[PDB]
Write a protein that binds this ligand. Structure first.
Ligand SMILES: O=[N+]([O-])c1cc([AsH2])ccc1O
Ligand SMILES: [Ca+2]
Ligand SMILES: [Ca+2]
Ligand SMILES: [Mg+2]
Ligand code: NA
Length: 329
């Protein structure tokens, strides 16, 4: 995969404990994870888990009441993943039989028929993945399958490559672009309509990096296209609306999973300081696992669109203007 991202310090220690073979043969870049504290007790599913680097990492972070599932279709990668279950149970939880992980073989677009067992409806709290979408062009079925396995309050928390415009037919047929995850890149606005068709009505930017195309033969197929690496979080929450409405609410981060909670690029909550929120963000806080570390005030009368944020114009803007402006400048 990419050059991608720097490994956060809290993970470094845990990676030193992970079997060297799992690390050595792992395909692609690490799945990024929500703040570590927020994972305790969660059920996490990694799509495209490979040899299990991210599954084993999460295994420790979710603790013994948490559970982790990895899914993949590369036989060679799973055989490796499957045979370090005990290794890691001992090393994390003092015994070979106390494992909170499992590995499933199947296409990520169809988790219900993955091979030891399927993933049932409404059973996962967090689905993670890094750079898996641009390799299939049935993105839609993949988004609907993630919607299906998530419980209410669950999130798809993921990184992929997107484009600031629609690639040409020629760019989408190119095999070098394809294998770099560029050629299957969605236009951000098409991505937004598509995950909303799958049921995720609200997409929050966590971070964005520029992705460059340098080879001058390649650049000719995608001449003014700007590509981005975006981490988004998309919550499955029954009451989310298409718009960000002010109902007079504020939320207060109570402490206990960091100095401050960073929900997305528009909303940071310093410990014990109330922050005005739109009702979608109130509802995410309330119905997701995050409620344990927050206090959210009651809905008042509808006050119109939410403006009580210092980037409120960008907050309401299409996804490509958010990404474009938050990348740099
Ligand atoms: O660099 N990338 O972002 C990248 C992403 C994926 As997916 C595959 C190969 C690559 O070089
Ligand atoms: Ca992976
Ligand atoms: Ca642009
Ligand atoms: Mg409100
Ligand atoms: Na384990």
């Amino acid at each position: 995969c990419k050059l991608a991202a720097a490994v956060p310090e809290s993970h470094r220690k845990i990676l030193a404990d992970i079997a060297d073979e799992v690390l050595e043969k792992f395909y692609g870049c690490g799945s990024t994870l929500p703040a570590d504290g927020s994972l305790e007790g969660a059920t996490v599913l990694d799509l495209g888990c490979g040899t299990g680097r991210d599954v084993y990492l999460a295994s420790k972070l979710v603790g013994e009441h948490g559970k982790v599932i990895g899914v993949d279709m590369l036989d060679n990668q799973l055989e490796v993943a499957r045979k370090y279950v005990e290794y890691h149970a001992e090393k994390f939880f003092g015994s070979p039989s106390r494992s909170n992980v499992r590995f499933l073989k199947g296409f990520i677009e169809n988790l219900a028929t993955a091979e030891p067992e399927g993933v049932p409806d409404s059973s996962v709290d967090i689905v993670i993945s890094n750079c898996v979408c641009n390799l299939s062009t049935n993105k839609l079925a993949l988004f609907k399958e993630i919607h299906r396995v998530l419980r209410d309050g669950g999130e798809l928390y993921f990184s992929d490559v997107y484009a600031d415009r629609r690639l040409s037919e020629a760019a989408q047929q190119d095999p070098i672009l394809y294998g770099e995850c560029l050629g299957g890149a969605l236009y951000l606005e098409d991505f937004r309509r598509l995950v909303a068709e799958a049921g995720f009505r609200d997409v929050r930017l966590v971070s964005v990096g520029p992705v460059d195309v340098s080879d001058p033969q390649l650049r000719k197929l995608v001449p003014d296209v700007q590509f981005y690496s975006c981490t988004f979080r998309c919550f499955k929450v029954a009451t989310l609306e298409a718009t960000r409405e002010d109902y007079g609410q504020s939320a207060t981060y109570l402490g206990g999973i960091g100095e401050e909670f960073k929900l997305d690029r528009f909303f940071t909550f310093p410990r014990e300081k109330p922050v005005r929120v739109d009702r979608n963000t109130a509802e995410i806080i309330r119905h997701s696992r995050l409620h344990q570390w927050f206090s959210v005030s009651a809905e008042q009368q509808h006050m119109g669109l939410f403006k009580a944020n210092d980037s409120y114009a960008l907050l309401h803007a299409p996804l490509s203007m958010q990404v474009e402006q938050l990348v740099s400048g």
